[PDB]
């Protein structure tokens, strides 16, 4: 039956994207934390 | 004088090969060859090659006579197991161990 | 219980088992000698023997009978013309099964050869 | 500083496991099972050390009794006779006498009858 992951790139980018993160005070902090931790990818990679 | 051959990391389960190895212990080289030839098991192929390779060393390297050779000793040890996943129902995963054998054959000369 | 029952099942249903026998007849009657598993071999005997014994009859009826199993007009033509006559004086036993010495590698199945007799 | 287990535990286990040689299955191979068996074996020995002293005396009494009845009297009579005679040779020796030196035992039986 229909499971929970139904990929959609526009949705993916418009949600967890870089610009989305930068727009909100909460999201900017995500990027701060991820950088501080040293994540290789601050934001979900998506092929546009 | 003895001659030996060891096939290590043979991808077959020790318990299975021993069944075949047991068939030729203490037999003349000629008798063993006869047995392995008509033994209906996968292991027979592997045990065969180690037997021949041991007989080869006997004639070549160790100054023994093919017409005197018998299987003085033979045994399988177990080598590192290959662990693989086997997906079961309701999300559970099992772990299959694809086992491994170190087959040894040691040949001696029956004087007379 | 299986008391006094004749004919193997060979793990095939009715139509498949029949097809198996027909196709093996076509194969045997075409090359004169085929290799199969010992059980299929033995069963093949009577199935073909009856076909051969009908080619010996020669009539149109016999041709139309044998054609139900064999289908191939060319083959049946070979059966009546080339095969059948060398069994004119022979009464049954037109085939033979001889068991081979080596088993199959992938499943250890015992093999044997079926052939038309000289 | 840090003092990790290191060598100590393996050594303690081997002591036990060596003491458990000869036992059946994991009792001689598994440390834990070896220990449980060794506890029982310590109590058994202590108990059987104490009871070995009984086990033999009962044998001695059976044997002395066997030789006595050959001479027409029973053990309970024989011992009393010996007491009245004032003979204090023990049962370990009486039994040895009863078998190795039968004529000597005969004489003791005599003095036993004479005493009453």
């Amino acid at each position: 039956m229909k499971r929970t992951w139904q990929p959609n790139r526009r949705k993916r980018a418009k949600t967890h994207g870089f610009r989305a993160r930068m727009r909100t005070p909460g999201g900017r902090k995500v990027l701060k934390r991820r950088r501080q931790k040293g994540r290789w990818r601050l934001t979900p990679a998506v092929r546009k | 004088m003895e001659a030996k051959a060891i096939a290590r990391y043979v991808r077959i389960s020790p318990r299975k090969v021993r069944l075949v190895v047991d068939l030729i212990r203490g037999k003349s080289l000629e008798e063993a060859r006869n047995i392995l030839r008509y033994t209906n098991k996968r292991g027979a192929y592997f045990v065969a090659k180690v037997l021949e390779s041991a007989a080869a060393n006997a004639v070549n390297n160790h100054d023994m006579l093919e017409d005197r050779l018998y299987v003085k000793a033979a045994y399988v040890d177990e080598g590192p197991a290959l662990k693989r996943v086997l997906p079961r129902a309701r999300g559970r995963a099992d772990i299959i161990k694809k086992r491994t054998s170190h087959i040894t054959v040691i040949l001696g000369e029956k004087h007379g | 219980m299986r008391h006094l029952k004749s004919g193997r099942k060979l793990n095939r249903h009715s139509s498949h088992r029949l097809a198996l026998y027909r196709n093996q007849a076509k194969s045997l009657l075409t090359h004169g000698r085929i290799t199969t598993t010992v059980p299929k071999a033995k069963e093949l005997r009577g199935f073909v023997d009856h076909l051969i014994h009908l080619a010996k009859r020669g009539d149109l009826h016999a041709r139309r009978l044998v054609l139900r199993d064999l289908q191939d007009v060319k083959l049946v033509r070979k059966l009546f013309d080339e095969i059948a006559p060398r069994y004119r004086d022979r009464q049954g036993g037109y085939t033979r099964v001889l068991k081979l010495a080596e088993r199959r590698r992938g499943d250890g199945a015992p093999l044997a050869l079926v052939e038309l007799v000289e | 500083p840090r003092a990790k287990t290191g060598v100590v535990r393996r050594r303690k286990h081997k002591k036990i496991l060596k003491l458990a040689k000869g036992y059946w299955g994991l009792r001689s191979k598994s440390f834990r099972k070896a220990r449980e068996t060794l506890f029982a074996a310590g109590n058994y020995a202590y108990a059987h050390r104490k009871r070995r002293k009984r086990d033999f005396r009962r044998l001695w009494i059976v044997r002395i009794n066997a030789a006595c009845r050959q001479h027409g009297l029973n053990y309970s009579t024989f011992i009393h006779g010996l007491k009245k005679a004032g003979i204090e040779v023990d049962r370990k020796n009486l039994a040895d006498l009863a078998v190795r030196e039968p004529q000597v035992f005969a004489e003791l039986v005599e003095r036993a009858k004479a005493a009453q």
Partner: protein, 59 residues
């Protein structure tokens, strides 16, 4: 059913006792009357192709 399960680990001794029947019987072989090589009886000799005193098969 309520999922039966072993109560105790099988001992090394009991495991091995169960396997007292698991031994293989060596193949039964007779000499070929033509080429003296060993082969299963009632089988066409895979070494020389002879059965019943005649050539039957290319080897």
């Amino acid at each position: 059913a309520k999922h039966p399960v072993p109560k105790k680990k099988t001992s090394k001794a009991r495991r091995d006792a169960r396997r007292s029947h698991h031994a293989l019987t060596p193949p039964t072989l007779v000499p070929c009357p033509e080429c003296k090589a060993m082969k299963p009886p009632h089988t066409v000799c895979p070494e020389c192709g002879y059965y019943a005193g005649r050539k039957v098969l290319e080897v």
